[PDB]
């Protein structure tokens, strides 16, 4: 059972949850520190992605320089040992750091950021040790040549940066600044994780509006306009710190990092003129992007089920699974470009075709001079440099269809098997490389029957597999605009994203919906099901246990009955008069404070502010299993009146489940009371309004 | 009193408001027709903006060719008569069509699209005659050289296209297609007006994600993900139809239209490298954009107040106000470039400086050959061509500071006076030209102390005045990206948009908030005020008249008492048992159907489907003042049970006004019932939850 998050506002001024109801210094202190924390989320995600890209380009660049040194001496067996050994060693570093120190840093974190911004309290997700294992595990596993990026891990790294900046450092290492007392809300934490995840998609692609639109469209359930401006400011500070550190280390000051433009996979030197002959391969790239994105979603759901059978078997088995996946990745990225025959160097293409090194197009791996290997252009590089080889402006029929089919089938296989291993893996770059493969294949199959470039058909195929897997339209359009710098490919990119989202929704759910189902996270979707308009929430509460209520002045003994014997996290406060909803955290707080009255007396509001500060009520640093309540003190009384949420959101008994789900998910509820049309008769949570748990208790509905 | 819109769903299956609760053909008929209508909104807004841009570039281009023909013969007095006469004639065409035929086509329509998508039933806004007067009035007033664009009018024109496509043509000219019966909802109309307004911002700037983000950020209050995809599809079909009609008429096939690129004001051939010396003029352009945008918002509020004093005085006075504004515009766009001395032609600048014609940079208006007039480059062109003269890549110190100050002070004066006249005017292009003026002035004032181009400082100044007036961040960033094609100016554009929104919010509201206040439209803002957490909705209902309720089986005489003597649009249905909320429209419908029972009988559900189709309940084609109810029939009975919204949204009496405003504006309510903690005690509408009407009844709150 994962608990939800409390984003509702107790409108008593003992709690001071509304930030505008504070002092005029403290409104200014909140406004200054939330824009400072948006600037610091931008500065720290930009600096960490600078250090991640510097370490990945230096380690994988010097590995491929050593591998190409043994390749250029025609020693192809000991260049396989250097490639397989450095990739096994970097995956061994990333996997002993994940499975022995921070196992929630495995995967991208985006299905549990989208769980957390929907209001599910996902444990161990945003920590310091989770952040540092994800930093050096992306530094290990992207430089180990694997089919993953540092793109999705940066979304988890930026939201981990945001939670440590908001709470003030690591847990039991926090500074006790009094100005960080206003970000102890769950609804101010949700703003921070939204700005940090948007800064992570901006640090992924050098994409500052597509980070804002990935948060809006995917991960954030609730959106204000006052968040979008700080989310905007966080992504602006990221891409400024990123492109300033591509402006520095331009003259080779930082090793092999920075030899490259400000714009990642910049294709912008081509004309995009729309013709009526290219309607048919553009919708074919959309239809095959939705079909292969649905097939990738179904086969990754099956692969992550069989990898969850390995992930429960032990912690040495996750090491051996990912080292076997990394051994398979390095053997098939080294040995498979021997199957491609060397194409000769085309004089119609502008730039230099006899090219050896660590990066660049037209690799010269097992060929004579004046020839190039078109498979080792893509397999024996980094995964980001292989995108720009497929994405190349004005290289017509560079890759053959056999080498494109080998690179497609390999990155289908490595797209399935490298996602579910226990490194910080991701889904932006493998789905980009699979879509690049079939998009360049459909561009090469129309040999001089089209006027769109084959490297532009690659961008259309990559955006179609990203729409066919993730079912997104607006966020990946600004992501592929801020990657590829083509403003005229943008409406054709819009058409292939919409065709692949609609062909993809015919078969599967989204790929973030699939891992949210597979991790068991209780996600609450937007539109209710049409059979929830026929079920009532009075009928939903008769299929439930009765309401564990409290009084206004309870005894201590009944409060420890509802705290020992129940697992519920809010309780209605009664007495013939519903007062509201007290929380479990405030019940453990009044047991730990020992604010115990000898008579049934409603206290005044000077007796509560002497016992409870607004920083005392917001702290969740209480456990129930330390309080030794003496049995003389169990016949004393606690006034539960001033700690009650005296205005909770209610529904009537005659309210339907579809309208109650709409109020539960629009205003951000954790507990919705049910009153009659006994002043309370029911209480609805997220578990009662998810459609799967309704269809357990009511199988006769659709 | 402007009524709100009914976007709530009656979950009885007599009404069939949920589209998924229909037949399997009709779910497919709704899905096919909503994507057909999104394609048709895209096709018709792209074709109408093609015809608007074709007519504006041919009429104003041949006017400026005739004016430059009299200028090149050194006949400067009869070129003033051709300029003033054609601008007075085109403004006379636009003003007799606005003030005598469709006076809601005056202005941009964006403060009453944002009213309509907030759920205020703005009358006479989306019609056919309003659309056609706005088409030929933008064709008149942009070709009359005025300080307005066809940018904001296209937002009203695309939403007018959307409402006529959704309802099936003009009012009392609609086709009676049975497949258009599902778009008779107000919540399906709201989806249409959102797709049409997004298609209008896309037809404004050739900007297909910035249209989607202008709807999200500004005009649409409620946002689903299932709308964003059809809104995405509508803007994709617009910019495809727009750029296909720039691909055709490229060889002069359509007159003077199409001589120009696919990208409007394309500046993309410059490097944007960030330096630490240019931190200070970039934040100076942001601070002056917020300060002059606040000063423009305050002075346009005063000018529109004094123009509302002219707009009530008659219909010939609005003609004479706009003809005097157009006479002042043409005299000061012709005569003021004689005050600028001719700068000589710089050989450091690449392209051709002795340039005469109708368009282009470096105009040669009153000069000798080898010289150019830098004021007639901006004043004696079209308003869009004068943007690209300021926005010019690599023209260093082209405009002098005196000519830039004359163009700034003129477009400040003409930005105030040409907005409130009764042509279809707008605010995107005058605020762009004012911000271009001071942005190029701050670029020229740092003479070789900066490395950002002076035409790029223009884009920063234009985005700062657009943020200083409209208080937007994300939508104008994609609008200026899809205009200027500079992906590296984009984070500097983000910084000047955020600095000018935050300096601008220190003084004023937004410029759409100001005309929403000035037109008296009851807009409902997102966050409640902090004094609404201390007021209760039980206390708000004791400062109100008591509840005009109904019974379940009322008499006819009590139904005509609540329909004659009240103006309320929903009534609670009682009897010791609250059933729900029947609407006023269903009460007039059961009086017009004459479903009158002789006894107090609750009917069965076969008696209602014989009397009421689901297309009969959705039609609002009923007036109350035609029904002649006989006094024998007033002692009969109507079963108001099957027409009731039996699950309305309720609050308790102890609920605060701040949480009730949050539920009113999140789920899209028109009537929120108040139950006790008499099963109803109150009913809240939009008027009760606006903060201004609370502060009338409760002045002691903050
Ligand atoms: N005070 C309460 N009294 C009785 N039932 C409750 C109470 N609170 C929650 N429930 C019900 O008990 C079931 C278990 O919910 P749970 O114990 O998880 O509540 P919770 O932990 O407060 O909610 P969440 O886990 O969503 O934060 C739910 O179906 C819910 O409706
Ligand atoms: N059935 C009703 N009985 C009593 N008062 C009502 C009823 N409906 C609305 N009111 C109240 O009367 C006042 C005037 O509202 P109005 O007459 O405009 O209702 P309405 O027209 O149904 O709502 P709207 O105009 O927002 O659609 C409001 O303050 C509202 O709270
Ligand atoms: Mg629980
Ligand atoms: Mg009314």
Author numbering:
A (entry chain B), B (entry chain A): 53 to 627, 635 to 736, 743 to 767
In the authors' words:
pmcMembers of the chloride channel (CLC) family play an important role in anion transport in bacteria, animals, and plants. AtCLCa mediates nitrate storage in plant vacuoles. ATP inhibits the transport activity of AtCLCa, while AMP prevents this inhibition by competing with ATP. CLC protein forms a homodimer in which each protomer contains its own ion transport pathway, in which three anion-binding sites were identified.
